[PDB]
Write a protein that binds this ligand. Structure first.
Ligand code: ATP
Ligand code: ATP
Ligand code: ATP
Ligand code: ATP
Ligand code: IMP
Ligand code: IMP
Ligand code: IMP
Ligand code: IMP
Ligand code: MG
Ligand code: MG
Ligand code: MG
Ligand code: MG
Lengths: 343, 343, 343, 343
């Protein structure tokens, strides 16, 4: 029954979850790909031939040569317009023998109302202001007179999603039928609503237990957790929040890199030194089996090799047998290296 | 590392989670007891000598002869006044060598405001109207200017909870130091926000994955899941929601029992026949290792023995090897029997 | 042929013979229950639902779900009025397919005369003064002219018992037909007429050999002997007799308990410390296979656990392989525990 | 621990218990011989050389070549004068390395008072009038002011028995020390106080369970039961009582024998035909392992051989595997034959 490989971020998000999800999908050929994304940010994957996917709704694992099911969990908050654009963009991949299943309880984003309600926190806590929490709050209100927030009710008047919206039993049966599943997490461990930076955090916990719960995955189904990290963790710009005591804020100049910016909001990313405290904390809760260390291209061999050893010792210190198996030297499939081959 | 025994409700709540938690605490002598309750639920335990505990905040496992830690998770919503009364009533048990730890991110209930904000859902969806969701929404708002909703901020002006409010690292360390842990879930599987009865449900998922996430417990720590059920499941009074296709609403009269009243509202409970569909669904997601079948005292031996076999076949049908280990015949410790000893 | 389970008291009586008899009857479902009580003893059983039986005549095992026969041996001394009240109170249990058999030679108590003849020993030896010995003496006189002492003769003029009074052959046949039998002893080992406290003793031996003889049970029929004991043995009020050299008289005050009152006389019970000498003596003669250690609720875990080990070593010392199988923590069915489950 | 061979009568007494006890004592060489006789009647043994023992108190097994202990049980009723005469008569056998132990609770017969009290029943029920029951009644009265009935109290003023009177613990220890024990019963099965002929019966049950109880022998100690019978059962003269439906009263003339008389009272013995009903009844309760068929000298080979087969079929019919091992053709050791040798 253990057939779910779960992808999670060990720092403050934007580490390369999309890159390893696409890479693992191409290598392991999962028949089911599942997620529970909110409109916060888009994940990128670039394959060997240079084709690029930027997803806010669909999992990045749709590039799997054995794709049979694409499932969007109960914890999802999505723009119907975005989902339509994303499906159409990968129509060749999402063919007649691929089933797209939207959980009946997934939240439909009202872009007019939900973005307007997040205008204040977009400045005060440096929030993305995408409407994710405002939509989540409307769901929680449980007004029986409101038939415009969950997918099951929206499907009654919006036929664009109607074919995809399934029942709870159809959802359970699809997981049961699945041979091998790729589950994709979002945001990052330190962004968790219940980690130390509150209120400078996101609207949910970004931990394996919360992701499985938001995707409706039974715990005995979990096979492996693949954690992702950067050599220099980033945080998204403005009054976004603090850092750990053993890390310092850097500049893109110090690193000799072109300043990194968010895709749509064009907010410059804040960059920090590696934090061993952050790793111990993330290793304790997230307990990954395998680690993908990305942006090794910003350091020299001794620098990224030293971080590999730090991560493995951080894991062991928190009863975790995490192995840094993959190393990222660029944004493409061809830039993902096996650790054992480069060091 | 696998030392967490988790107690969860397989139906619509109020099945005897309080009773088995107290029973297991006395038998297994856990050093740590942990929960993440909201004010919408109350749990009862009665020991061999007739002492009674009715808890809305504190775990029921505080009766453990080796109690060292009492921990209230980040997912908790609590009335400070209630916590003070619950502590005072078990002051003999909660002695100088017992540490009470309230997660810094646990929510402090604003009795007046939060209850006022749930007037309406209390009638429309048959909600408890205890303020649980309204408090949860205020936390989610993440207003940096609001220092009155999370325990960490409230402790700065309310010295009643100040000694108990810990840091995130203190929380992680307490779990790490623990020898054996009793984790107590609340509400019930079918009350989940993401199960089929939405909006006639609670404000979170009532599944093992969500409980571990709300208590901040790493997944490799889970040892055993003990699922609880009744021979005749119950719901709260009013327009509380629908039922499964294979079950029917009954009356206390039909059962020959004195009408049951809800724990928080002095309201009459709705009673239904046993549902095999509900069991298959609960077994699939919750995957319990052991089952406590309670209220066998409302049936004849053939009746409750037949339900034991139904539960085990429902389990096997959903790849779960659940064993009905305990049988309940009354509200006290002495009424919990080993299934092996009675059938 | 070995199908008789015999219940006997290892000390001075009133240790919980009634309780274990009811408990074993409910668990093992004996078709035949047999005794040979005199009016000097009363035995109590309280079931899981709170129903109480206090018997001076009828066995306590009438609560057996497979009851077919209730037999009162040749050694019985009974008040017809009492037997009628005891039958009436359990008329639901003693239905049309339950045969009550009174041995033809059982003694009918002459309340006025027999009680008048025990005035004196009631003060001098602290006797119950119930008429037991006086009735027994009248039987022994064997006056062919006396048709008012044995059941067989009384039945000729007293139609209340006539249907129940059987022949000797009917008695033998009922035992032969029985599948599984529960035999209940009375008083206690140290009250034996032939133990060291004479004349401060009862009018017969309270040993397995005497009970089988008084119930007319062939010796190859004996399967198992269940001996009963208290952590602090008791005696009746007054000049009831001495104790063993290794034990001391206590007070209910010293024990922190409400003073206990005797079953027939509303008199205060004398309490003593546990005697290892009494156990060795009782184990030697009575040779029990299983032991029920009752009133563990008057001690702390170390106290009652230590007495369990004393009993087993006292047993081994007298070539007896007695196992303390049951532990009593209260007066009801739910308070009987398996020793294996609590220590 | 199984080392007690018990001798019992299967009819109405006077069958040859003394003859087989002496025979078995000489053959098996028991170190301990035990009994619990009342003054009712004397048992006879005649050895190969013609020496004769007529005992009312001492066991007949004192002829054992390995005699170490002679024990008189708590159930004994004896004349001190008789015991003195009997010991003196066998002084050569009861030497310095043989210990005589009288149970402290054995009854001392007051020949003046106890015989006078039995004058009425000696005529009415054809009783022996030896005082046995009158002495037994005085013991049962338990008057603390009476120091003249039990051996322990009589020893304080009658030094003739003082050396022999032991404690209860000395009694238990002597049985424990014993290698092989010969236990001798008295009277006979059909004479039992609780058999069908009441009041034309004796003052106790004449069954293995009552004899072991009266001798204070633990039940696990029983090895073998040797039952005794006559080809023509007798009953002791006068208005002694009835018989079984399948037997008839005969005359000594019909048998061609000299009329049999009691030793002291010179009462002619009543003689009856063999009763198969009597055997079935005796086999059921007494369950003997071996049978001694005596007075085969009053019949022809086909007559006594036919009774052997009747007895074995009677045994089998009552779940008894009794083997008629010994056949009696006279009153002497030399007259006891092994069955396998004569048929
Ligand atoms: N090692 C790398 N060097 C340079 N650019 C990279 C590397 N790995 C990934 N990228 C780019 O980093 C950017 C930031 O990540 P973004 O959130 O947009 O998607 P992602 O890489 O899949 O990250 P995540 O899914 O963790 O949010 C992406 O545009 C991606 O193409
Ligand atoms: N077998 C039973 N028969 C009768 N009453 C019972 C039984 N088990 C529990 N009870 C009582 O019925 C009620 C059912 O519980 P509701 O909260 O009230 O459950 P709980 O045991 O208190 O805990 P939980 O809500 O977690 O199930 C409680 O008041 C409890 O004491
Ligand atoms: N563990 C216990 N703790 C407290 N009370 C008990 C316990 N066991 C029995 N009792 C009660 O104390 C009394 C002791 O019994 P006494 O006759 O009264 O014993 P019994 O159980 O009634 O039978 P028996 O005389 O054969 O021992 C009874 O009233 C009984 O219900
Ligand atoms: N087969 C026999 N033939 C003739 N006389 C016998 C035979 N066996 C025993 N006797 C005599 O029968 C008589 C009657 O028995 P009595 O009670 O006096 O002693 P017992 O033979 O040992 O009998 P029991 O011990 O059974 O009472 C004795 O005097 C005895 O010697
Ligand atoms: O996917 C993500 N990548 C990076 N930062 C994120 C992501 N999601 C949320 N955040 C950060 O989390 C905080 C709160 O985000 P919100 O959930 O959009 O309100 C802000 O500081 C965001 O920049
Ligand atoms: O402990 C509980 N027992 C039973 N029903 C509950 C409990 N908690 C919440 N509910 C149900 O959850 C829904 C809303 O209650 P609320 O979560 O308190 O708002 C209703 O359908 C209630 O009946
Ligand atoms: O059931 C009983 N429990 C306790 N003592 C008893 C019981 N039956 C008899 N006795 C004791 O036996 C002696 C005489 O009581 P009697 O047998 O009723 O005459 C006294 O020492 C009593 O204390
Ligand atoms: O040892 C015995 N042999 C034969 N008859 C006996 C013996 N003991 C008692 N009886 C008979 O038993 C009856 C009652 O005897 P009691 O016990 O002496 O009063 C009478 O019919 C006696 O003849
Ligand atoms: Mg991103
Ligand atoms: Mg409840
Ligand atoms: Mg009693
Ligand atoms: Mg004789």
């Amino acid at each position: 029954m253990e057939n779910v490989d779960l992808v999670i971020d060990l720092q403050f998000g934007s580490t390369g979850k999309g890159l390893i999800a696409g890479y693992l999908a191409e290598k392991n050929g999962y028949d089911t790909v599942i997620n529970a994304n909110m409109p916060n940010a888009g994940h990128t994957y670039i394959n060997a031939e240079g084709r690029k996917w930027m997803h806010k709704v669909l999992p990045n694992g749709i590039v799997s040569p054995n794709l049979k099911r694409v499932m969007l969990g109960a914890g999802s908050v999505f723009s119907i317009n975005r989902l339509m654009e994303e499906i159409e963009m990968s129509k060749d991949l999402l063919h007649d023998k691929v089933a797209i299943l939207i959980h009946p309880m997934a939240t439909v984003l009202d872009e007019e109302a939900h973005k307007k309600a997040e205008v204040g926190i977009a400045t005060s806590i440096g929030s993305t202001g995408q409407g994710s929490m405002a939509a989540m709050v409307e769901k929680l209100q449980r007004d029986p007179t409101n038939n415009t927030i969950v997918a099951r009710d929206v499907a009654q008047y919006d036929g664009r999603i109607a074919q995809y919206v399934c029942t709870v039993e159809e959802w359970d049966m699809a997981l049961m039928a699945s041979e091998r599943i790729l589950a994709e997490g979002a945001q990052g461990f330190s962004l968790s609503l219940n980690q130390e930076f509150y209120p400078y955090c996101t609207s949910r916990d970004c931990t394996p237990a919360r992701f499985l719960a938001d995707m409706g995955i039974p715990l005995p189904m979990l096979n492996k957790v693949i954690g992702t990290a950067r050599c220099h963790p980033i945080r998204v710009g403005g009054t976004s929040g603090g850092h750990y005591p053993d890390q310092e804020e850097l500049t893109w100049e110090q690193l000799g890199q072109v300043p990194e910016l968010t895709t749509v909001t064009k907010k410059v990313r804040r960059v920090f030194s590696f934090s061993f405290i952050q790793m111990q904390k993330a290793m304790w809760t997230c307990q990954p089996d395998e680690v993908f260390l990305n942006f090794c291209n910003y350091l020299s061999p001794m620098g990224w090799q030293d971080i590999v050893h730090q991560i493995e010792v951080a894991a062991q210190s928190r009863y975790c047998d995490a192995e840094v198996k993959y190393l990222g030297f660029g944004p493409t499939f061809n830039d993902v290296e096996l650790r054992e081959d480069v060091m």
